[PDB]
RNA sequence: CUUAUUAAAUGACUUCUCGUCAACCACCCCUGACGUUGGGGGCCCGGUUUGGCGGGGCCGGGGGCAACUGGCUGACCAGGCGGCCCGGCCGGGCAGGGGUCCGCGGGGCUACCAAGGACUUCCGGGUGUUUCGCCAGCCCGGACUAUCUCCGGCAGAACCGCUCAAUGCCGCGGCCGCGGCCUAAGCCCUGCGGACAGCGCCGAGGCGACAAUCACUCCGGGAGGCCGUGUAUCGGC
DNA sequence: ATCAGCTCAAGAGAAGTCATTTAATAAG
DNA sequence: TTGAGCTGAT
């Protein structure tokens, strides 16, 4: 196991051992820290030598989930898996339907204006902006704590003109130029063909393994089966839909969404909670209200653990946007 | 790299409307005290007529066992903002004057650096869970008309409403000698009648930050290399 | 008097037109 | 995807 180290100037250093991590914290020379992805690291409180060896990052994008791996010049140091749960198209469809009904029943007749709705600069649909921004944040937060010098990614391609079914390629092809533009600001980029990915996978023998095979290809590092495996997913909430849509008996509409409501906790926050004499660490599914004076907490995969008394919940970290999960 | 063809992804405007909830009126049915009056119900699902969607009229079945419906009004983010009015920037409010589409008609103009506006361009504003902050989308104002972006109609077409359905037809110029004259189904303005609204616009979308984040093994507070600035997988024994 | 376990319901669609980004191919 | 209702228990 290795602990990432970050210098007083904000550069990543080379990773150190857990023993050095312990003693640097104990002696007060460095502060322990967690990344936005929850990865533990240490920030120095002293200048130290800045010499580092090569480190490379690989990202193998999928539609539903991605593989990520980090390798030193010697070995793979990390494997990870990233989930993006495809929530935005339904949310935009429901918002569109509600807008259409609202305008129908609440506005006069209005002119149809569709001929000249020009778009200025580069454009992406909200779903593709969502997935690009998530993948960029993952990469950008990995490059924050590791001395990444090279980014490796497969350049997905599909012949849409000859096969109509290609949905799960379109969702990853679209937005690639913005991704590649943003990648090159972090580190030098090596694009990889799908055939090269296949060849390296078959040579060396969870899709983080495929991203690791792209590393073993480009940089020749050894495989590391003992490397830790992490699961990360973007947190999803009902951000502005404050109430349920259909009026129920006597015309009531129950409240639904909102990430903040003037309380202490907020839905993205990471918390430790007690219930039935047992301790849980999780993320705030639900907020206290005048009637429902409980905090809903969910596990790393987004399923609610339960509802908790607000006295028994301790705030660990405010919303990072991600959950995290180490796989034993 | 410009333009085009095919195919995916998912964003916008508009029309038509389902779905949910609530109140009142009219009619019908079961049942109760003695036609007056009182409790409750009058519901669903599938098929069909159309190019298609929603009403309506038919066909059939379920579930009740009681046969099986009309009219009309209000609500579906919380709220925010603009126009104008009344009282004294706070309180209350929608009278006036605006917005769009359709039918018939008129005035001025022009043939693509068009007619001359704006879903063009530039600047700015409203809205957009919030602890703070940013963005997408929509809408609006002023300044020009921006290094150029955009501007139509008929049939099919009906039991009704809407719709550029598949398809078919027209206009996107004509005439003369690059230039000139003329003229629209194109551009600007506008009259009378009808439709939507009852004063309008935006509200169910994406995200950043937060030090409360103190780890990993292993013993029973400590251990899990010393040095090259107490980083290092690189170098040194 | 309040903690914990278990349960419940939850808005959706046709059509006209238009617009980006990413393929494979044209033609310049 | 999340607030809220209901019950049993101490
Ligand atoms: Mg707000
Ligand atoms: Mg047609």
Residue numbers in the entry: 6 to 210, 225 to 347
Text of the article:
Like IscB and Cas9, IsrB contains a RuvC-like nuclease domain that is interrupted by the insertion of a bridge helix (BH). However, in contrast to IscB and Cas9, IsrB lacks the HNH nuclease domain, the REC lobe and large portions of the protospacer adjacent motif- (PAM-)interacting domain and, accordingly, is much smaller (at roughly 350 amino acids) than Cas9. IsrB additionally contains an N-terminal PLMP domain (named after its conserved amino acid motif) and an uncharacterized C-terminal domain. Previous work has shown that IsrB associates with a roughly 300-nt ωRNA, which guides IsrB to nick the non-target strand of double-stranded (ds) DNA containing a 5′-NTGA-3′ target-adjacent motif (TAM).
To characterize the molecular mechanism of ωRNA-guided DNA targeting by IsrB, we analysed a ternary complex comprising Desulfovirgula thermocuniculi IsrB (DtIsrB), a 284-nt ωRNA containing a 20-nt guide segment, a 31-nt target DNA strand and a 10-nt non-target DNA strand using single-particle cryo-EM. In contrast to Cas9, however, which uses a recognition (REC) lobe to facilitate target selection, IsrB relies on its ωRNA, part of which forms an intricate ternary structure positioned analogously to REC. These structural and biochemical data show that the ωRNA forms a compact, globular structure achieved by various RNA interactions. The gRNA–target DNA heteroduplex is surrounded by S2/S3/S4/SL2/SL4/SL5 of the ωRNA as well as the RuvC domain and the BH/RECL/HNHL regions of IsrB. The HNHL recognizes the minor groove of the heteroduplex through interactions with the backbone ribose moieties.
